[model samples]
Target: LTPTERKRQGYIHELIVTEENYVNDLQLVTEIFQKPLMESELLTEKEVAMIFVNWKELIMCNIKLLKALRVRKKMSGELATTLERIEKNFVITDPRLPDNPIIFASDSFLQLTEYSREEILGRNMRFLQGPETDRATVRKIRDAIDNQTEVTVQLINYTKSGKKFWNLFHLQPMRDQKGDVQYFIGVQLDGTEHVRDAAEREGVMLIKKTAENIDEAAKELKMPVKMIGDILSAQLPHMQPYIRFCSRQLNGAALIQQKTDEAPDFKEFVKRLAMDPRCKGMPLSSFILKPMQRVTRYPLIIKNILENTPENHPDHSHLKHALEKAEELCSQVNEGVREKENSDRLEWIQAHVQCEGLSEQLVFNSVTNCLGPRKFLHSGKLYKAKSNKELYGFLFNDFLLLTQITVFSPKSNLQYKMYKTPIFLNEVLVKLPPIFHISHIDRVYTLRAESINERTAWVQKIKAASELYIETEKKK
Candidate 1:
């Protein structure tokens, strides 16, 4: 590179040149730009010279062009994607503003609402509010922002399509460097669906009320035909059970000792039974007093007949029949307790909100999911155990049944007893070892048993069993 070429190359153009400094400028250009000029046939020293002279202006112009092209090409797509993200990801809308100015954070809102960034920018958020916007709600929002507080309210707002919607507006005021309110940040839930559902529920409720009024009117009129018709309609499905109940009562009562015979005194029989060391020592016999006293209310002697007959003997039918008759009488008393006109029944119905809004009488299926008389099958066994101790026993047949027996430890181990029966289906108990010891509640894995007596007994038994097992091992 020559002093002449260096001058031509514009390195010294910004500074006053002197003959003495010519060599330094030539060296700079040769080191920086000379290689590029040598490699390219398209550019010569003259072109390189021009680039060096207008470098700042040329670089700025290219940068501006690239930016314009990028924005023009992808700006709309980016905006659409943003709007989609906002609608789908964010809970707030309408009265809410996005943290970023770009529109369409959520696609669903963009596509469904058909709104654009230009249409939304700096727009008064109140454009979404309308006549239905209650004064109380607006005041709450205003006061919250003014006080720089956080607040939440359910608001009725209008969409771009003029559709009224309910929104759950959660608002918080953002502060600036000066501690002045900058913007109110809010999250919204479009509760339009819930509002529509509530309206529909109101309509259904009105219809139900009307139906109830008609039923009440019919009842007040005391129309025997209507009453009979209603009863027949209601009782048709239950006719079989009702008839069976009636027949059982009639047959059972017929087998009892005739009213002509003297009513056997149950108190004397119970006293005599209690006096017998063998019978009195049993836990079950201790509870016989109450049942015996109540037995005198009927004509037949229940305990006497039961005592006189053998369980396997044909004559036992007489005792069984008498017991059935007693049960029927008890059931009649229960019916009296449960009848609709009973104050207790009415009080129970009024206690729950579910029944408060009920219009017509609802009939529930008695046997659809019923367990029936089997509920009492284990009751007698529960009361028969001796010893004050609690015992946990498990049965692993088709279904696993867990029993908790709490024995009354009075003299001779006879006192009141409680039994806990945990009834399970075949699936659970089959996997459990019959006599396994559990160290803790978590180790006693079966999800069985319902009564507190049973659960406590089970836990204690598991702990005891675990301790015994441990002790046995230590001895070994």
Candidate 2:
């Protein structure tokens, strides 16, 4: 055979080795890690079943991809076209040239970079690099090429029209039988979609965590207060209903997290396999921590997604509402953690609060929301006039308690009137803004806050508590 024929055969052999490695990695993911995770009950049965269905499709596509690469070896001068017919983008460069001119580029590469065959031919690959491309990654590639070693790097690159994209670029130095460098083969994969999908998955997981935390807190409070249903019926009438709704949402989110986490590690494993030198030092926990931090930034990310989505889009309204709810829930969780230092004060009040027939079963009590110096009015003629008091509030799974700071004569100090009427939110009608009326049986109390916002907050809590009360009563 001529020297050119020998060179062509060498390139073909290299293609076979590259493709074999790809197939092996795919097999490891589907047969080894994914199969066991599915059967181990780490995910729901339906999710496990769905995973295999999806994997089969991916596996089939990969098999076809491998077959196409193998067939290219037999084609003369049509190797580029054959690669173009496949899904992956690829380019072959003349390494002997000073600028590494592109001797051949697949159709996928032309399409990805928005450059035609005529425009791409004889040009160095650096034409695609842009201002934002990482200098460190570029250095790594340069060093690897100088040493004639294989290297894989993810870097920002731009298309002919200046559209930016994340590119996972793999480069290998092809050598002749004499060990002289013949060509540099570069494999390009666009990773923009993968980055976006991973981000959304992280958001879903964070929301799942938020739901779990809230549900656990609610459940712990619920069990102890089951015996004194009437007192909770009066104080936190809607606590049960609130807990139930959170529980339902929590269950759904937990299932979503499970399914999402079970997603085939095909992409991750392939990435790691190709770039093991760079990835080997990174632990699984470090990998996990990246997505975890991404999850916390969901509010901003979701807001941008919502804004960019058109009004007519099916997900527009859903995304909008989901953003709102996530922000609210995340805010609550943050506040709870931030104020956890006040737990000692809360426990002190719970221990000292004086009320008749108040069951010790009220094992959980914390201030959900509070405002001070509110005017409180009663329905009876004797108490009809508004009383200016520093109102203190407490929330439990089963009840609501309101107290006023009063003078302690003997001590010449201040203490809250612990023996105060607790409002069962279930039986009360809540009206928003400045004034809220809570009516139970024959008595009605009116609370007026200093600001409209404060009053609205009080009304929302009361309404939520009332719903829980109604739900608890129905369960009985």
Candidate 3:
């Protein structure tokens, strides 16, 4: 027989003998260790099943290894593919020499460091260590290797480019057939992303807790605004100045809506952060807004309770006086928010109007009071007016503009179409009712409100704006 053929035959015989011994060792562990533990009642039935479940995976790995050896000659392509798969999936290293030179490193390990086999081979694993690498973890690994035992630790490691990452490393001593330690096998898993994720989670939790606490406080002090308004309206004849004070307090509280509107940009940032996989479905914007909403609602809530309380009540004077101060605080915050909103809106209007070449004059004029794109039925059309387009009314120092808002597409900018030319509010008179009237000389326009309260609000705002214009004209 040829020398090569004799060598192949001997190698195949050795592989078969090795596999037999491996099967025997597995059977010995199952029968001696596993079976005894189960029968001794030390482990539950489920626990015994779990042991075998893990054992099955090890058995499968060994079976593949044995099969690869059995067809060693024909396995050049198959074995290469199998080894490559393992190298891609796991960061593996073999440290063998007395001085612990790396004998081999898997492709995953090389890729993780951005290093080639030539650069990493014959070097100690400490080459991956950085200034921030935990010395205690390094010591533990060293001790485990010296004692020929297993150890797992997390430590900072540096890539070839010097970028640091957290490494979850596990090291075990591998022994030969005679049970003498031959090499150390090390596996590494990246933990840097997980560390950052945990920190972000902690921050979100803190913010969420603050929001929840404020929301709970707000819920605990629930007093309906409608009920409060009704009670004050019933007693209006006897307390005119006090009722007016309550109205002013509520108007200040209404400015909170403008503050709420300003938060869309802030909300978008939080929403994008919450979209991260680590956030685990937490709504960050709702958490942040809950506190703001509750805080804003406080002024009206306190004022309502104070107005309803009697002089004989023990806490009435204290609450009444305290609530007046609270209204002042609310007014300050509301005014600040209103100023900010006006500034931002002015800037936005200036930029966009200039871009569109609409009107440079419009930019110079300040917004006095803006009303909704509210559903207001026109008196001229009568029954048909109920289906008329909802219009937004913008009151300026000189004129009132009713504009219809339209969007061409989901991504399009809001396009405003003038429902009519600017109606000069100089001599116009607004009448109050659910079915209200606006008289501009010979042109009498009747508009119907959705509610009596809304009609009252429109009348008050229009009268205030008209009075301001008349006063300005008188000065002229």
Candidate 4:
């Protein structure tokens, strides 16, 4: 119960209990003056405690009633404040409630939209629906209300200022005691900008899907050889040093063999090896095979040195342990190499052989067919430089140069075929390190410098010696 009610009850209880004359007078009044003809008389003093308890129960009940009334009053006040703040307040004007108008227009409506009480009072809600109103949506609402069903629909509406917006309209039907529909209540939520943004996001997703499909289709056909060359050229220079380092090692030779090896029985060998007891500890085929193949190129002589020794001989004591270690290393290397070779040989052939048709189609379609149309040609030629000792030999005959070319076709399965084309000259220089395993090409360098001098007068004017000195410094 509320504090005020509690305090009031406490005051009344104290007065009744403490005033002896007042209690005696109340008892006499109940018995003589106020007793009903059909009711019993007052109790004696022996029942004073019982009367006191009854009085406390009555006070508690009265306090509870007061508390309920106070809570109801507070709730009504809050509701009044909320209703007053509504832009358009509504109430039943008549008991019959015929087409109740939106009344009690708030200041917020006057400030935000251009509507006045006079304009809104007698108008029906149809004033908000304009030519753009979805007729089907409105019909749905009417049908739901007529059928006594609750329904929500997205509808187009305009404000007093003619600003268009989408509204989620909800209609609820209310009924009276006679079971007749008394009124149709409505609520609207603005949703125009939200719908527009959702549509835009869907459109973007569709375009992204289309672009991905195009990329996938492009991958199905072979790309141009020159395009492929350009792409490789861009990537090859950065990898040149590492490539060259590998080329100088036996690992490089193994790489070439691994790429070209494709025998019919290769796959079967792999299957057998995978299931073999010897390969129990080996990893997946792809992972174990790569490094294993390089071990195959190690000299067989190294294997022999480690595997043989006589245990009975006097010198056997010193060599027996070494021999056993050598044997163990030989077995490990061979086992690893065989596993890798099986996988590599099978994969290399699969990729290159199946792709030969696409490669051929790329070249044949681009090559010039005309006799004089700068006929695509691969030829071998030799040129002799001049020698100083012979008559004017130094001018043209001392130095020699040789050049050759070979055509690549689907049938040309040679590894050397890749080297015969007019390779990207700059890429050749950078990528050659991996192919040759050479730190420097000193002979080629001098020849290149001489060629540069011959082609440009600026180099000749600098004097070959000075030019070389500057070039060396620049390189440093």
Best by lDDT: 2
* Per-residue lDDT over 1-476 for candidate 1, one digit per residue giving the tens place of the 0 to 100 score: 23322222121111111111222222333433344334544344543332232222223432342233233222222322232333231222211122222211233433333444336543445666888788789899878755667776667877777778776556654333344332334544555654346764554444334333322322211111101112112222231222112222222223222321443553233244344322313322222122222323322333333444446655456545545655554454344324423322222212211211234422111111122111101211212123323433332111122334322111233222113333332112122231222323322443333455754555454444334434544664
Candidate 4: RMSD to truth: 44.3
Encode model 4's per-residue lDDT on 73-191: one tens digit a residue: 22222332443444331221111122434422344443333565446643466677889898998899768855866675677878888988776555554443344443344544454
User: Where is model 3 more than 4 Å wrong at Cα?
Assistant: 1-79, 87-96, 193-476
Q: Candidate 2, which segments miss by more than 4 Å at Cα? A: 1-81, 193-476
Candidate 2 C-alpha lDDT tens digits along 1-476 = 34433333333333333344345444655665456556666566644433232334334544554554444333233332334345457777755444666766665677788887657766788988999899899999999887988776678999989999887677766654456565677777676743446764554444334333322322211111101112212222111212212212223334445644666653355344334322323322233122123223445544544554456655556656656644654454344334432332343454445555666433222223222111122111111128754576654434567765552122343455554666655567765336567666777777666566766666676677567667757875
- Please identify which of the two predictions, 2 or 4, would achieve the higher TM-score against the true structure: 2
Q: Candidate 4: misplaced stretches above 4 Å?
A: 1-79, 85-100, 103-113, 176-180, 194-476
Best by the TM-score measure = 2
Task: Go through the candidates in order and give each one's C-alpha lDDT.
Answer: 0.34, 0.49, 0.47, 0.33
Better of 1 and 3 by lDDT: 3
How many collisions between residues are there in candidate 2?
Answer: 10
